[PDB]
Paper text:
NA is the second most abundant surface glycoprotein on the influenza virus surface, and although its enzyme-active site has long been the focus for the design of antivirals, it can also be the target of therapeutic antibodies and novel vaccines. Here we report the characterization of one of these mAbs, CD6, which is effective in inhibiting pH1N1 virus in both in vitro and in vivo studies, with a focus on the crystallographic analysis of the CA/09 NA in complex with CD6 Fab. Our study reveals a unique epitope bridging neighbouring NA monomers, with a large number of contacts between antibody and antigen. Importantly, this epitope is conserved among circulating pH1N1 viruses, representing an attractive target for the development of novel therapeutics against influenza.
We therefore determined the crystal structure of the CD6 Fab and CA/09 NA (CD6 Fab/NA) complex at 2.8 Å resolution. Comparison with NA structures previously reported suggests that the binding of CD6 does not induce any major conformational changes to the CA/09 NA structure. Although the 150-loop of the active site of pH1N1 NA has been reported in both an open and closed conformation, in this Fab/NA complex structure, the CA/09 NA 150-loop adopts the reported open conformation. Additional positive electron density was observed at three of the four potential N-linked glycosylation sites Asn88, Asn146 and Asn235. Similar to these complexes, four CD6 Fabs bind to one NA tetramer. However, the CD6 epitope is novel, forming an antibody footprint that bridges two adjacent monomers in the NA tetramer. The H chain of CD6 Fab makes the majority of the antigen–antibody contacts, and forms a bridge between the neighbouring NA monomers. Ile103, Tyr104, Tyr105 and Tyr106 at the tip of the HCDR3 loop consequently are in positions to have hydrophobic interactions with the main chain atoms of residues in both NA monomers: Asn449, Ser450, Asp451 of one monomer and Ile216, Lys262, Ile263, Val264, Lys265 and Ser266 of the neighbouring monomer. For the L chain, only the residues in and around the LCDR2 loop contribute to the antibody footprint, forming hydrophobic interactions with the second NA monomer residues Trp219, Arg220, Gln250, Ala251, Ser252, Lys254, Ser266, Val267, Glu268 and Asn270. As the X-ray crystallography showed that the binding by CD6 Fab did not change the conformation of NA, it is likely that CD6-mediated inhibition of NA is through steric hindrance, that is, CD6 blocks the access of substrate to the NA-active site.
Numbering used by the authors:
A (entry chain A), D (entry chain B): 82 to 467
B (entry chain E), E (entry chain H): 1 to 224
C (entry chain F): 1 to 212
F (entry chain L): 1 to 211
């Protein structure tokens, strides 16, 4: 009934409290649960939901054979209530997609689902599940988008999409989407930057995006912009390097750190003045563990000093993609935009001996109150009978 | 592939009429507004007319410079766009383009597909055939290893002419010069430069065609 | 009625240089589109809504601006980029285009290679007499031709044509045609072309006499 | 709360964008999914739903044995949300039926479910799931109806039913149904035409139906009519022949093309002036592939020239029934009736070695914007355990 | 009073152009769609074109018989309607009417005000002046109560001519006969009947004017 | 594309008779409009939306119909009503008119009053010779003129013009012009006009000889 203002700033936040955990893979050992990946979260003014990409197959069935290329015509984007297992029985269909995004503007859901061939992919935009627009690949090379929630403000929602090589210069677009119709589109001019899998959030009527540099950066690139898509760019300066893989922490850069800069994971961070809350794997070479770090001058300064770290998943346990999501005043009652986050806990291939690959998920929400480090890992015993 | 093949162009007298057409393919013509944009020789681009889709009642819009003389129209069942031109003036002489506009809401006015175009010449001068004169160097000038030959095309109207060498097998070290008008006749020329062992050894010949007069002349370049 | 002014009109650049061309508007628009035209072909759709590159356009290009000021920039210009770039708006009826910015390649100076050609036999027999001179492959483009008949400058009956900058080697060429009556041609011995070009302080000269 | 006007015309449409895909059969390998067929779609002012005919049995269970005659007393008509698997756990019961239709009038659902013996079948009409009328076989020979959505306009819904031989002249009726009660019934006078399995849609207060000639036509017959059931008839003139099986494309007819005219598939097309959007299999002998073709003068002219073709399923993959459905302004927000379509992707018998036969489904919706050809096939590996 | 005075005149050659205008007064021209309807000599009525009000974007509509040749337009600030005609044919010869339609919802299409026409003649025949010959009774009878005189107008083009008697003071017992065309020249006649005491007593004179040739002839009817 | 057919094409009526004229449509319309045209003036708006009379139209007129059949009726026809009545529709684009129904007044028969006129002196001097005959004020309209030169019928060089029914007295008039060369006129004595009209079994004759 009323569009999200998006005009307040981010809630001050001293630590992260556990919000959900689905235990998908443990349950899927017997249940009817989808093989999934990209398990992001997004919230309405009424409820939070987890969105995900199915291969269209169930844990412990032959069609979970992971020989299928990532971008098949079987892949679809679906959603279920937060913390419930993604099951064919409790899940809502959203889009035919192998890359996706989603956000609610206060009135309805927008979904963005990319399918078609590598040289000609089309994003299909729905608003209240009705197709409202489309956009074709413009560099003819794997049009792809966030794998987490878009950000809405003042009745407009905002996203980022990339088309081009994943290991060289590509083309990056920001879009202003209004009631599911693209109303503005800007091609960013960012030579020597790589933007992929952006985690965008709203904060005082502007959007900020922290993304993945898959070409040559182990710190994360950011782009931020207002409702008119007047933008700025950079990289997170902190020497607490955010990507995976990455070197050991040392002096950082405000441009891409080439050292172990190739490849990466989807990740996120939250800006607070000159400071930054950083989410990252614990391992430096592999997608293991997860910790949150507060670096008070980390957005704009290049040292290693941080004030506090909070454990989330032990170094010894499997993790994967991570992403931002927020809760507005319109949902929470607060005078500020509450930052949360979710973590994909990948099981199966390539790291373990199974024919398949599936995520479980956890999430936390920031609070200005007491919290504790722990490890909340997937917990499935592998392999499965298939 | 989306394509726009226009036709109908030609030579016509001041005050005359012409009906340009455009055949579209590769898309659903019926869903699109369509445009004609034109370009005077040497001079840049000018929108002339716009007709809309059925679903906007085929509404028509015109540039002032063309208002009350040109009419735009379409036949969706044949994928055709039309421009009827009446009371032509020498100013309307130009290359005429069939032009689809972008369906993108966020780029209103972007013209995303152009045709090759069709040529319109408005003149009271009349269709004349060329004369093609071979040009060999002056006898006795034999020295340097390379050598320049030539072909001269005189007293035709209108444009264009096709000029090739040995039917197109020769395109290295060629310069074909712009035509120039003088008392309502055009003139043009073309040099070809080669190694002096290849000529007079091998046959070098210029090939000129003038569609508007249905002429096709070959001309050999002999010494003397 | 909305006017577009592009600057500069002509722009010369060495390969590798960065270049910018500008497009101003008499009043404000939301965004600007641009097209690329080489001679003898249709414009190509080059950029839309200020910054979006058309398929096939390389990353060297980028487009910017807002309100009444827009531009197109080439980070490292290459020779194939030589063309004319037109801007265009459609914020209100009617749609309008700018005057174009023509992009040219700079290069080392080159003197012309001058050739001279008498009237053909075939033309003579029909009562005409044309004498041709080609001044080929020179840089820069400023060049001057003087005709002489038995040593007297001759101005009437001359037609000149200059080529576009060549694509392989970036030079220019020119053609000059002194045209007379057969009768007036036969009253004189010597015909001469006189090329003047900054590359030399003396003119480059080519001549022939009718007897040979 | 408000009846659909149905008075606007069809949205202009340059191509087809992917809307849903259920992956029923791949999932049914392990899940609890019905064996289904006739999987059509129809939309409310609030949501789109897929309706289907179950045999009352699950993939990979002995009762999926396809020895049962098509028109058994076990067959029922059910619905589930669009793009979800038809499962006993997520599906709504509608009617006991071996032939069916359904549509929403803006206030409630009408369903039409035909059961009983071959010589005496009865259609039962429900409105909001309450029986509101019935109609008995009048030629005593397999009363049957659309296998896709009826069309509603101005508070009245409209369908077509056929009774008689499937390989000779039969009897064709159009009906006007109001709040689930038949208020008018017309027997069409169409000697030498055969109408079966009609795909009907609304367009400017009139209904147009493109159907299957199973007797002697490889082009499709059409009938169109207004709210009073004053009708006209013909066949699609385009030489891009629409049925399956069919000859290679050549000059067409505005009456039935007898060449390969026997048998067929349920199909559809959409009229636009003299033009036509045609859906059809890619194969000419068998139910393989699917493509959409735009023929600008195809409704009323008999040549082969078309302006554009768009791939939907590759020639090498299995397809089957197809059908129209639309989305009104009252659902979409638009000023025009949006045309969509769905495709049944048949797996199992008679073409493969299984005891059963089940459909998966895909759908697309027409847009006047960017789109791309691809193949979105079923993707189940056959055979199954059973 | 609402009035529509059209103008833009008469004679023009096949393939020619003409711009008809109409000045409106007595109402708010800007609020009304407007129409041109025409009428060939001795034939009936044919709608040709319609332009709408500003508030419906000046949308234009045309009869097929005129599509691609005629353009309709308005200038609200001057209360003018226009019809530009190009590529005229002899069929387009006709009386052209400026025509306001009824604003009544319940009578869509009723044309509630018509102008006098403006006459359009499309012909390759040339403007020729008449000859006016007085006609008196035969030299002899001098009999009955009354007597019939006559005036004959020959070899003019185009229409019309004005014919009166004693400048219009005489209009009783007059018959003025339709003009008839023969080899691209018109002919017409007119009898006047009076009492034989009034003539030759009083002067009876015929007055003929031919606007298109700027001729004005008086002719007296003398006995023989 | 919607066609209108009016019946009859011509209609003759005595003053005081009731008269009806019809207008059919190829397909259905909501209503019909009608206009009145007399020769030499613009149509007048006569009736709108089937039955509504335009200001100035008298009550004798009334208009009816629906669907595809409409009509205009005059309860007691008067002489001023003589004109052509056109119907017109605008249910769908384009608007169309019918073919018209021409209304004429009936009256008592009247023989013509025939006058004959030699070439004027002014025309002779320029080399022409035209002979004129007026057959004025007759009814009904059917009339035939025969020219004779020294007694031989002569068909070439004749131009005829007929008037509209007159408004005062309802009669018709005709004009016939035998036009020759001065040379050929001078080779002959007698010029004659021969009016044939149902009102007489003998032709009405007028003649002169060239003295
Ligand atoms: C919030 O959203 C509204 C609607 O999207 C914005 O209103 C537009 O403002 C621009 C310029 O500021 C105008 O040119 C548009 O025409 C306005 N649209 C409407 C519907 O009013 C508004 O500016 C936005 N507010 C902020 C603070 O960005
Ligand atoms: C839309 O529906 C209404 C109700 O079904 C129609 O109203 C009927 O109109 C017919 C004749 O047109 C009458 O004889 C009925 O008695 C009317 N019923 C009611 C309840 O009013 C209406 O005509 C339909 N509109 C259109 C455009 O078809
Ligand atoms: C956001 O908008 C509301 C409502 O107008 C206002 O009262 C509130 O203080 C705003 N917050 C900020 C940070 O601007
Ligand atoms: C998985 O897929 C591959 C590739 O087609 C196939 O060779 C293999 O046998 C499959 N393995 C299983 C366990 O299904
Ligand atoms: C349909 O009806 C609505 C509501 O009265 C009307 O405004 C609209 O223009 C109609 N549309 C068409 C296409 O006839
Ligand atoms: C299916 O039915 C056939 C025919 O009666 C039978 O032979 C076969 O065993 C059945 N299969 C199963 C799994 O029930
Ligand atoms: Ca990296
Ligand atoms: Ca720090
Ligand atoms: Ca068939
Ligand atoms: Ca065709």
């Amino acid at each position: 009934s009323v569009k999200l203002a998006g005009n307040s700033s981010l809630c001050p936040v001293s630590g992260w409290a556990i919000y959900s955990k689905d235990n998908s893979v443990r349950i899927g050992s017997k249940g009817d649960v989808f093989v999934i990946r990209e398990p992001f979260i997004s919230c309405s003014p009424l409820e939070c939901r987890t969105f995900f990409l199915t291969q269209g197959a169930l844990l412990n069935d032959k069609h979970s054979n992971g020989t299928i290329k990532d971008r098949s015509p079987y892949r679809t984007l679906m959603s279920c209530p937060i913390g419930e297992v993604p099951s064919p029985y409790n899940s809502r269909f959203e889009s035919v997609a192998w890359s996706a995004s989603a956000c609610h503007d206060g009135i309805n859901w927008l979904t963005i689902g990319i399918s078609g061939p590598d040289n000609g992919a089309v994003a299909v935009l729905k608003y209240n599940g009705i197709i409202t627009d489309t956009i074709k690949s413009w560099r003819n090379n794997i049009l792809r988008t966030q794998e987490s929630e878009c950000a809405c403000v003042n009745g407009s929602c905002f996203t980022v999409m990339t088309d081009g090589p994943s290991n060289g210069q590509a083309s990056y677009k920001i879009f202003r989407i209004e009631k599911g119709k693209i109303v503005k589109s800007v091609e960013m001019n960012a030579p020597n930057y790589h933007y992929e899998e952006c985690s965008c959030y709203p904060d005082s009527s502007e959007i900020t995006c922290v993304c993945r540099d898959n070409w040559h950066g182990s710190n994360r690139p950011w782009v931020s912009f207002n409702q008119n898509l007047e933008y700025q760019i950079g990289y997170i300066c902190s020497g607490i390097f955010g990507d995976n893989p990455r070197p050991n922490d040392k002096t950082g850069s405000c441009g891409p750190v080439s050292s172990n800069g190739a490849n990466g994971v989807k990740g996120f961070s939250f800006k607070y003045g000159n400071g930054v809350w950083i989410g990252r794997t614990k391992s430096i070479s592999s997608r293991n563990g997860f910790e949150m770090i507060w670096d008070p001058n980390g957005w704009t300064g290049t040292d290693n000093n941080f004030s506090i770290k909070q454990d989330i998943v032990g170094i010894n346990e499997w993790s994967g993609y991570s992403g931002s999501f927020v809760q507005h005043p319109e949902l929470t009652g607060l005078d500020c935009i509450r930052p949360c986050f979710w973590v994909e806990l990948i099981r199966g291939r390539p790291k373990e001996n199974t024919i398949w690959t599936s995520g479980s998920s956890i999430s936390f929400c920031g609070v200005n109150s007491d919290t504790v480090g722990w490890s909340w890992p997937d917990g499935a015993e592998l392999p499965f009978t298939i | 592939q989306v394509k726009l093949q226009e036709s109908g162009g030609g030579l016509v007298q001041p005050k005359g009429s012409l009906k340009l057409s455009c055949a579209a393919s590769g898309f659903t013509f019926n869903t699109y507004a369509m445009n004609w944009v034109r370009q005077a020789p040497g001079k840049g681009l000018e929108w002339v007319a716009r007709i809309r889709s059925k679903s906007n009642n085929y509404a028509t819009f015109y540039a002032d410079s063309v208002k009350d003389r040109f009419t735009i129209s379409r036949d969706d069942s044949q994928s055709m766009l039309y421009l009827q031109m009446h009371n032509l003036k020498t100013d309307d002489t130009a290359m005429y383009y069939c032009v689809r506009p972008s369906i993108y809401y966020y780029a209103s006015g972007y013209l995303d597909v152009w045709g090759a175009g069709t040529t319109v010449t408005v003149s009271s001068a009349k269709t004349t055939a060329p004369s093609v004169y071979p040009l060999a160097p002056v006898c006795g000038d034999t020295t340097g290893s390379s050598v320049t030959l030539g072909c001269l095309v005189k007293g035709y109207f209108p444009e264009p002419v096709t000029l090739t060498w040995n039917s197109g097998s020769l395109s290295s070290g060629v310069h074909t010069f712009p035509a120039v008008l003088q008392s309502d006749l055009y003139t043009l020329s073309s040099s070809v430069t080669v190694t002096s062992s290849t000529w007079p050894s091998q046959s070098i010949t210029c090939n000129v065609a003038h569609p508007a007069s249905s002429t096709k002349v070959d001309k050999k370049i002999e010494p003397r | 009625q909305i006017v577009l002014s592009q600057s500069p009109a002509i722009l010369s650049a060495s390969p590798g240089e960065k270049v910018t061309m500008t497009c101003r508007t008499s009043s404000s628009v939301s965004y600007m589109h641009w097209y690329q035209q080489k001679p003898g072909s249709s414009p190509k759709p080059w950029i839309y809504a200020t910054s979006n590159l058309a398929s096939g356009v390389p990353f060297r290009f980028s487009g910017s601006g807002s309100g009444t000021s827009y531009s197109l920039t080439i980070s490292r210009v290459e020779a194939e980029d030589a063309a004319t770039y037109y801007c265009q708006q459609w914020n209100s009826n009617p749609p309008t285009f700018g005057g174009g910015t023509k992009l040219e390649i700079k290069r080392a100076d080159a003197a012309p290679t001058v050739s001279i050609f008498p009237p053909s036999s075939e033309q003579l027999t029909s009562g005409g007499a044309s004498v041709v001179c080609f001044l080929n492959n020179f840089y820069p483009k400023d060049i001057n031709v003087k005709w002489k008949i038995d040593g007297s400058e001759r101005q009437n009956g001359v037609l000149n044509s200059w080529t576009d900058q060549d694509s392989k080697d970036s030079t220019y060429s020119m053609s000059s045609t002194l045209t007379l009556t057969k009768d007036e041609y036969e009253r004189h011995n010597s015909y001469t072309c006189e090329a003047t070009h900054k590359t030399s302080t003396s003119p480059i000269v080519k001549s022939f006499n009718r007897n040979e």
